[PDB]
Each structure stands twice: as C-alpha cells, then as structure tokens.
C-alpha cells in the first residue's frame, strides 16, 4: 500500500508548506512595507533549526513509532479472532474442493478425510454435525461393501468351478 | 502413445483426443484424471467418468470401450 | 500522537514566541504609532489561532483516514487467512454425492 508516500505528502506539503505560504501571504495582506518586511527577519533567527529536513523526517519517524504501538495493540485485538480454525489442520481433498479444480477424485482420501474430520448459530453446528455423521456412516458402509463384494467374488469362484 | 517410468505407476495417454492420466499404487487403480477441455464438456460429466474408471486394472480394457463409445453415439 | 502534532504546530506557530515587547522595539525605528501597531499585532494573534485550529482539523481527518485504510488492509489479510464454514458445507454436499 505504501502509506509512507501519503503520510509524507501530509507532513511535507499539506502541513508545513501550507502554514509557511499562508503565513507569508496573509501577513503580507495584513499591511506598510517596513513593518511586515522586518518583523519576519527575526522569525528566521528564532524559528531556525525547526524546518531542517532531517529532524522532520524524524518527526515522521516518531509519528511512525506512535503508529507502531497503536498498531501493535489493535493488531492483536483483531488477530486473536479466528472464525474457523486455519488451513494447517484440515484435509487436503478439502482444499481441493473449497479451492475447486481438483482434477482427481478417489475414495481413499475421502474415507479417511471424513474419519479425521472433527465435530464442532446452532444452524450450521447442527447441520454440519449430522452431515459429518451421515458421511462417516456412508464410508463405513462402503468398506463393508468391500467386505461383501470380496466374499461374493470368492464364493462365486467356488460355485463356478463346481458348475463348470 | 503413453509414457511409462521404471515401475509403470505414472502414465498418460490419449483415448480419443483427451489427456487421461492414472496413478496406481498396485493392481487396483487408485486415482483417475481427465486433462483436456473439449468445448462441449460439463463438470458433472467429468466426475461421473473418473469415478467409473476407478477400479481394477484388468477391467480397464472393457471399461474404456464402454465409456467412450457412448460419448460418440 | 495527535498531541505530538499539537506540540509541533504550536512550536512552529507565530503567536507565542513573538511577544509585544520585541515587536515594539523592532518596529519603533520606522513607525511610532503605538495603537495601529497594537492592532496589527492583534491581527497576528487571530490568524495563528485560526490556522492552528485548521491544522488540527487536517490532522484529525488524516488520522481517521489512516485508521480506515489500515484496518481495511488488516481485515483483508485476516479474511484471506480465515476459513468459512458455508463453503465447507457446500463441499460436503459434493462429497455426499460422490459417495452416493
């Protein structure tokens, strides 16, 4: 975002240049010649070392420091807040769904994926809990389907051998 | 034409004009993919074909003829 | 913060470091009419006050804008790093279809 350019515009021209130009122009408009053209020869002699560029660069630095503590505190107050637990503790196929375009679907992931999915305003809570129930139930039905199909295949080989 | 490594696990070949690649841990096929975009294709049809193609390696020959003959009918 | 800018603008103002005494002694060599020079000094107080209140107005506005843009960037970062439950449920529906 580079907020430094905007802040530098604010403290370089919007603040200092405005006050300097306004002082000169308005005090010139206050008049005659001598009073204003001399009263400002002693303002340079006593406001000196206040418009040097280095120390007002430091002025931006200490306003940056003030930003540092306020930003630290309000950074915390916003970023302990987590809506749903973050990326690192979820299923890989679940990223393949939520980000889309998986290009590859299978059964092995989704089986263990729903097995290790943890249960968790009551709207989404209840529907997610019962849907996770339903899906883990469906996948265990699928693996007992392996049990049934394997048994049937072996027994079919037996009966086919007898009949042939 | 297809490419094979020293263990014949990775593979990629064209059935008619579409890139289909397979990953096999053992004799059973454990993964499928279709890597071509014909400008008549729907995402629903993509899922119902790879799931069907999932299976053993011995029934791949019969299934390739069965699935890809319905598309051009 | 804001008070730092108050102090800086007060230091860079004209209305305190310029006193009536040295003003009078510097002017006296050319014009000796005390009353209209007092009037001109009184004019020089008011302009400093108006410009410094105006400066406070700018610094307040810029501070509010900084809060806004900064909070929005941090919120965008948090939203990028956060997850939504509804998208997860939508994915679970597709998982159910595949299993079926």
PDB file of N, CA and C in Angstrom, chain A residues 93 96-97 101-110, chain B residues 21 29-34 43 46-54, chain C residues 94-95 98:
ATOM      1  N   UNK A  93      -7.915 -33.025   0.391  1.00  0.00           N
ATOM      2  CA  UNK A  93      -9.024 -33.008  -0.554  1.00  0.00           C
ATOM      3  C   UNK A  93     -10.009 -31.902  -0.220  1.00  0.00           C
ATOM      4  N   UNK A  96      -8.922 -29.218  -2.047  1.00  0.00           N
ATOM      5  CA  UNK A  96      -9.232 -29.490  -3.448  1.00  0.00           C
ATOM      6  C   UNK A  96     -10.684 -29.160  -3.783  1.00  0.00           C
ATOM      7  N   UNK A  97     -11.586 -29.271  -2.806  1.00  0.00           N
ATOM      8  CA  UNK A  97     -12.970 -28.856  -3.022  1.00  0.00           C
ATOM      9  C   UNK A  97     -13.146 -27.348  -2.867  1.00  0.00           C
ATOM     10  N   UNK A 101     -11.322 -27.001  -8.772  1.00  0.00           N
ATOM     11  CA  UNK A 101     -10.487 -27.647  -9.785  1.00  0.00           C
ATOM     12  C   UNK A 101      -9.561 -28.708  -9.195  1.00  0.00           C
ATOM     13  N   UNK A 102     -10.100 -29.802  -8.646  1.00  0.00           N
ATOM     14  CA  UNK A 102      -9.228 -30.845  -8.090  1.00  0.00           C
ATOM     15  C   UNK A 102      -8.584 -31.701  -9.169  1.00  0.00           C
ATOM     16  N   UNK A 103      -9.322 -31.946 -10.252  1.00  0.00           N
ATOM     17  CA  UNK A 103      -8.934 -32.745 -11.412  1.00  0.00           C
ATOM     18  C   UNK A 103      -8.745 -34.222 -11.093  1.00  0.00           C
ATOM     19  N   UNK A 104      -8.898 -34.640  -9.838  1.00  0.00           N
ATOM     20  CA  UNK A 104      -8.669 -36.038  -9.478  1.00  0.00           C
ATOM     21  C   UNK A 104      -9.519 -36.359  -8.257  1.00  0.00           C
ATOM     22  N   UNK A 105     -10.435 -37.310  -8.403  1.00  0.00           N
ATOM     23  CA  UNK A 105     -11.311 -37.733  -7.322  1.00  0.00           C
ATOM     24  C   UNK A 105     -11.136 -39.223  -7.081  1.00  0.00           C
ATOM     25  N   UNK A 106     -11.104 -39.605  -5.807  1.00  0.00           N
ATOM     26  CA  UNK A 106     -10.962 -41.006  -5.434  1.00  0.00           C
ATOM     27  C   UNK A 106     -11.773 -41.302  -4.179  1.00  0.00           C
ATOM     28  N   UNK A 107     -11.557 -42.473  -3.588  1.00  0.00           N
ATOM     29  CA  UNK A 107     -12.287 -42.903  -2.409  1.00  0.00           C
ATOM     30  C   UNK A 107     -11.401 -42.910  -1.169  1.00  0.00           C
ATOM     31  N   UNK A 108     -10.112 -43.210  -1.341  1.00  0.00           N
ATOM     32  CA  UNK A 108      -9.213 -43.375  -0.202  1.00  0.00           C
ATOM     33  C   UNK A 108      -9.099 -42.091   0.613  1.00  0.00           C
ATOM     34  N   UNK A 109      -8.811 -40.962  -0.061  1.00  0.00           N
ATOM     35  CA  UNK A 109      -8.774 -39.707   0.673  1.00  0.00           C
ATOM     36  C   UNK A 109     -10.062 -39.507   1.433  1.00  0.00           C
ATOM     37  N   UNK A 110     -11.187 -39.489   0.719  1.00  0.00           N
ATOM     38  CA  UNK A 110     -12.442 -39.051   1.307  1.00  0.00           C
ATOM     39  C   UNK A 110     -12.838 -39.935   2.478  1.00  0.00           C
TER      40      UNK A 110
ATOM     41  N   UNK B  21      -4.761 -39.431 -17.357  1.00  0.00           N
ATOM     42  CA  UNK B  21      -3.603 -39.909 -16.620  1.00  0.00           C
ATOM     43  C   UNK B  21      -4.066 -40.709 -15.411  1.00  0.00           C
ATOM     44  N   UNK B  29      -6.493 -49.565  -9.547  1.00  0.00           N
ATOM     45  CA  UNK B  29      -6.310 -48.157  -9.882  1.00  0.00           C
ATOM     46  C   UNK B  29      -6.868 -47.318  -8.741  1.00  0.00           C
ATOM     47  N   UNK B  30      -6.045 -46.420  -8.202  1.00  0.00           N
ATOM     48  CA  UNK B  30      -6.442 -45.631  -7.043  1.00  0.00           C
ATOM     49  C   UNK B  30      -6.760 -44.179  -7.387  1.00  0.00           C
ATOM     50  N   UNK B  31      -6.422 -43.719  -8.590  1.00  0.00           N
ATOM     51  CA  UNK B  31      -6.697 -42.344  -8.975  1.00  0.00           C
ATOM     52  C   UNK B  31      -6.954 -42.278 -10.472  1.00  0.00           C
ATOM     53  N   UNK B  32      -7.738 -41.281 -10.876  1.00  0.00           N
ATOM     54  CA  UNK B  32      -8.034 -41.026 -12.276  1.00  0.00           C
ATOM     55  C   UNK B  32      -7.960 -39.529 -12.534  1.00  0.00           C
ATOM     56  N   UNK B  33      -7.696 -39.088 -13.779  1.00  0.00           N
ATOM     57  CA  UNK B  33      -7.853 -37.656 -14.138  1.00  0.00           C
ATOM     58  C   UNK B  33      -8.105 -37.523 -15.632  1.00  0.00           C
ATOM     59  N   UNK B  34      -8.805 -36.454 -16.004  1.00  0.00           N
ATOM     60  CA  UNK B  34      -9.013 -36.083 -17.398  1.00  0.00           C
ATOM     61  C   UNK B  34      -8.499 -34.661 -17.567  1.00  0.00           C
ATOM     62  N   UNK B  43     -18.860 -30.057 -16.027  1.00  0.00           N
ATOM     63  CA  UNK B  43     -18.114 -30.538 -14.869  1.00  0.00           C
ATOM     64  C   UNK B  43     -18.768 -31.762 -14.240  1.00  0.00           C
ATOM     65  N   UNK B  46     -17.508 -34.799 -15.895  1.00  0.00           N
ATOM     66  CA  UNK B  46     -16.122 -35.103 -15.559  1.00  0.00           C
ATOM     67  C   UNK B  46     -16.035 -36.031 -14.353  1.00  0.00           C
ATOM     68  N   UNK B  47     -16.876 -35.803 -13.343  1.00  0.00           N
ATOM     69  CA  UNK B  47     -16.792 -36.595 -12.121  1.00  0.00           C
ATOM     70  C   UNK B  47     -17.341 -38.002 -12.324  1.00  0.00           C
ATOM     71  N   UNK B  48     -18.412 -38.145 -13.108  1.00  0.00           N
ATOM     72  CA  UNK B  48     -19.030 -39.456 -13.265  1.00  0.00           C
ATOM     73  C   UNK B  48     -18.230 -40.389 -14.164  1.00  0.00           C
ATOM     74  N   UNK B  49     -17.210 -39.887 -14.859  1.00  0.00           N
ATOM     75  CA  UNK B  49     -16.350 -40.723 -15.688  1.00  0.00           C
ATOM     76  C   UNK B  49     -15.108 -41.211 -14.958  1.00  0.00           C
ATOM     77  N   UNK B  50     -14.442 -40.340 -14.197  1.00  0.00           N
ATOM     78  CA  UNK B  50     -13.268 -40.770 -13.445  1.00  0.00           C
ATOM     79  C   UNK B  50     -13.644 -41.768 -12.356  1.00  0.00           C
ATOM     80  N   UNK B  51     -14.787 -41.558 -11.699  1.00  0.00           N
ATOM     81  CA  UNK B  51     -15.239 -42.494 -10.673  1.00  0.00           C
ATOM     82  C   UNK B  51     -15.501 -43.863 -11.282  1.00  0.00           C
ATOM     83  N   UNK B  52     -16.141 -43.896 -12.453  1.00  0.00           N
ATOM     84  CA  UNK B  52     -16.337 -45.162 -13.149  1.00  0.00           C
ATOM     85  C   UNK B  52     -14.999 -45.796 -13.508  1.00  0.00           C
ATOM     86  N   UNK B  53     -14.075 -44.997 -14.052  1.00  0.00           N
ATOM     87  CA  UNK B  53     -12.775 -45.521 -14.461  1.00  0.00           C
ATOM     88  C   UNK B  53     -11.997 -46.084 -13.280  1.00  0.00           C
ATOM     89  N   UNK B  54     -12.246 -45.575 -12.076  1.00  0.00           N
ATOM     90  CA  UNK B  54     -11.659 -46.174 -10.883  1.00  0.00           C
ATOM     91  C   UNK B  54     -12.065 -47.640 -10.781  1.00  0.00           C
TER      92      UNK B  54
ATOM     93  N   UNK C  94     -21.066 -32.112  -2.133  1.00  0.00           N
ATOM     94  CA  UNK C  94     -20.472 -32.808  -3.270  1.00  0.00           C
ATOM     95  C   UNK C  94     -19.850 -34.134  -2.845  1.00  0.00           C
ATOM     96  N   UNK C  95     -19.211 -34.157  -1.673  1.00  0.00           N
ATOM     97  CA  UNK C  95     -18.660 -35.409  -1.159  1.00  0.00           C
ATOM     98  C   UNK C  95     -19.768 -36.441  -0.978  1.00  0.00           C
ATOM     99  N   UNK C  98     -20.704 -37.854  -4.375  1.00  0.00           N
ATOM    100  CA  UNK C  98     -19.719 -38.814  -4.870  1.00  0.00           C
ATOM    101  C   UNK C  98     -19.857 -40.157  -4.159  1.00  0.00           C
TER     102      UNK C  98
END
